[PDB]
């Protein structure tokens, strides 16, 4: 399915350069095309956004939910035990950090295969494409990866590399992965594709609810698959801050220095002026030696005032500069509603959309995938596939 | 009023960026060269008359202040125009109990009858089409016969 | 395995010069390529970061965790007894200090061999390389060391130096150490390599969980093995502070001095001016003697204002300038959650990532390695290899 990616590459390339061009002025290297941001109020605002939203969506407390509901309690308390011991909060911080930059981070959550260390493989927008319908559901997802020499298992790599050729011992070849909705059936089919062909013995199917690959957006906009971010609407105000304060500091460094101008047709030499203990009296007219004195004290103040205006408005733009209850008591008890309502009132419906596009499908794929090799006995028959209540 | 704010602050920032830079003008008929001026550790003494090198100094500090004052006026009036800048009870307690009437009355007193019109053009027909459409394949048994199609009371 | 290091040297050299170039403006000599930093707000911010994070990750209190759980209590209270009497907090301060400069500090924790003094040998990024996969696990680690003459034990050194040659009595030869994941097996194999060959009788194996060599990062970034730091995104703002305040002080020292200029074609001599008790009247016109008076009082103020701006923003950047509860009462009781939440809200997910990449593998390798020569009887059979619950 290399041709599908190369065809609808044009369907993602407007979203690509927006994401990359809006990444540059707020974090160095979450998107390539060192080299530091010149001044970085956006870099702190972004991390504060992530640090608030991590406590907002799901804290350490119970977030996911007469004689029968004890079996409801165990199946929804075992998932929080599985969610920490596999280190989910390590990579979901990266996910949400990508979410408030680009717009569409994927979250691969592969099969357990025991009780080992299974990491949430993340993907960024320079690797995958999604097609959506008029109503707003997924149709097909085409992820790409580069693979090194020995990082792939050698189970398959004999036949796909037996076509001919002596290659370098770190040859980076691209591999693809496609999931698509069937024509007649409502199940999704998944497979990998290497070297421009199907793989030996890897094709699989998945039920209706729980896709193995969860796409996400942060602001919903119909008509197309992906979505925007609100740093895409503070982009120009941040761009003006960077292109202002670079000029501010590079003006300050020129103003600080002292290039003393001495007259050439005078009597004084600078060679005697260079050697000077304090107190001695060296010859020379007091007219010749002067200094640069470029004389912009008030002209700096307009730049510092406009910078203060941008600095103060970006402060309320990115949830920063807020006296809060970070002075907690050993746990976070009622904190998530305060921070959640404040980020709702400052950012848009991000606490609303991430409760039905992040809190929902992670719980669905982790109540499907974890129960494949079933590690907890479900006692009742009435609510074997119960509701999924997120957020509250 | 918003259009004037955009077409003002674009000029404000693009004035600030020109004022921040330093295009030092050196005289051409002088003795000083800029090539020696470019290389300068702090403290060394390089030749040259102190008349030739000057800077732009476009000199509008007070003329910026009228633009910043008119921007402050628009910024302060748009603040009350769009319900922003209001100390509220967003410091809630785990739920919203009595909050909806306070916010509703404040947006009524600031925006017009939007809380009135959206209680009879949004809260009403969504409830009507969701008490018709959901009961087509009926998922809850209606017990009484007296109020099978009852009233629709919205807002309050 | 000298050739493996010399091959993927290119895989680390972008991370090398970033770490070394970002070390220079914040601490003198945690990385070579005396010579003091010119002005050093970063040097204090870095040590305050370490001093907060040391109480954050693990204090003196119990951090690691009906009739059966007493045996859980002893095995997790003996490890805190072993963690102080071998002086771990001495070298882990160096480790975390390397962590918020470079990005990848290794923590060797060799075998006990009794109950002697066994030090956590630290490694820095100029000595070792790690390869990672697409999911994010380790594959191979190649550490380097230089060794002096008699510092190595002489158990082996006869055969490796019997190749021929009369060498200097402090000849620094490099030695290497490789650990790698097997092709078929899931155990790691470890060995040393001296002089470009295998060593006599030293090759060993290790179980699945507890690697003897624990790599670490501070901000997670997929696609490559190592990682960045947030001083890599305050680098330019700190660099401007150093290159500003060097000019500030070297302007102040020139402005303080007094090189009095006397006219040469006048009547006054400076030789009579040099000798002067207060009160006497010495001859001379009051036109000839003047002073330099370079006259930049307002031009200094723009440099001091821009320095104040950088100084105030770096203050909140490095957790400094925070009124806290360092006025404690004999112990730290509830303190670790306050400091932990504040550094979470200021630095990123460092308290999250170091609870699953520092607090986890140290506990795993110290519940594997300490129980080799087993010093505490495990009573129950149900939780002999129990869970590892970190952070909380």
Residue numbers in the entry:
A (entry chain E), C (entry chain F): 13 to 45, 54 to 85, 104 to 430
B (entry chain D): 275 to 430
Reproduce passages from the article.
Phage portal proteins are key viral components located in a single pentameric vertex of the capsid and they act as initiators of capsid assembly. They are also critical components of the DNA-packaging complex and are involved in tail assembly. Here we report a number of crystal and high-resolution cryo-electron microscopy (cryo-EM) structures of the T7 bacteriophage portal (gp8).
A second cryo-EM data set yielded a higher resolution map than the initial one used for phasing. This map at 4.1 Å resolution shows a different conformation of the 12mer portal (gp8open). The overall structure is similar to that already described (RMSD 1.03 Å), with the exception of the conformation of the channel α10 helix, which is kinked in the middle and deviates “upwards,” instead of pointing perpendicular toward the channel axis. The kink occurs at a region containing two adjacent glycine residues (G386 and G387), which provide the necessary flexibility to change the orientation of the N-terminal half of the helix. The movement represents a large swing of 90°. The density corresponding to the tunnel loop is partially visible and reveals that it is in an extended conformation, allowing the connection of the now more distant α9 and α10 helices. In gp8open, the kinked part of helix α10 occupies the “upper” cavity of the channel or α10 housing cavity, thus defining a larger conical channel instead of the two inverted conical cavities observed in gp8closed. Therefore, two clearly different conformations in the T7 connector were defined: one closed (gp8closed) and the other open (gp8open). Although the first structure described in this work (gp8closed) would impede the DNA passage through it, the second structure (gp8open) would allow it.
